[PDB]
């Protein structure tokens, strides 16, 4: 009930890929944007735009490449 342990990470696969390639402070802003997205206070296009700005194209490509080589389902 308090601080539960689960094999699956609460954060999504996309976030996990970026998290391992980005600073924790930077993720704070990303996480904040995510809350806005969940609250529908942010447009999805805006989220992607901001996400791309935060991660950078050089990181987005790496994330995309990782996702392509991700044989999990």
From Swiss-Prot:
Residue ranges constituting the RST domain according to the UniProt record: 2-73
Induction: By ozone, salt stress and cadmium.
Disruption phenotype: Small plants, altered leaf shape and early flowering. Plants lacking RCD1 show enhanced resistance to methyl viologen, tolerance to freezing and supplementary UV-B irradiation, reduced sensitivity to abscisic acid, ethylene and jasmonate, increased sensitivity to ozone and up-regulation of reactive oxygen species scavenging enzymes.
Compartments in which it is found: Nucleus matrix
Tissues expressing this chain: Expressed in young developing tissues, such as young leaves and flowers and root tips. In mature plants, expressed in vasculature of leaves and roots, and guard cells.
Protein's job: Inactive ADP-ribosyltransferase that functions with SRO1 to regulate oxidative stress, hormonal and developmental responses. Required for embryogenesis, vegetative and reproductive development, and abiotic stress responses. May regulate several stress-responsive genes. Seems to play a larger developmental role than SRO1. Does not bind NAD in vitro.
Subunit record text: Interacts with the transcription factors NAC013/NTL1 and NAC046. Interacts with dehydration-responsive DREB2 proteins and a number of transcription factors belonging to several protein families. Interacts with turnip crinkle virus (TCV) movement protein P8.
Note: Plants overexpressing RCD1 show a weak rcd1 mutant phenotype.
Name the UniProt record assigns to this protein: Inactive poly [ADP-ribose] polymerase RCD1
Organism listed in the record: Arabidopsis thaliana (Mouse-ear cress)
Lineage of producing organism: Eukaryota, Viridiplantae, Streptophyta, Embryophyta, Tracheophyta
Gene: RCD1
Full protein: residues contained: 500 to 572 of 589
């Amino acid at each position: 009930t308090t601080r539960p342990k689960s094999p699956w990470m609460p954060f999504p696969t996309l976030f996990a890929a970026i998290s391992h390639k980005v600073a924790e402070n930077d993720m704070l802003l990303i996480n904040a944007d995510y809350q806005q997205l969940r609250d529908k206070k942010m447009t999805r296009a805006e989220f992607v735009r901001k996400l791309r700005v935060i991660v950078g194209d050089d990181l987005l490509r790496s994330t995309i490449t990782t996702l392509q080589n991700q044989p999990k389902s």
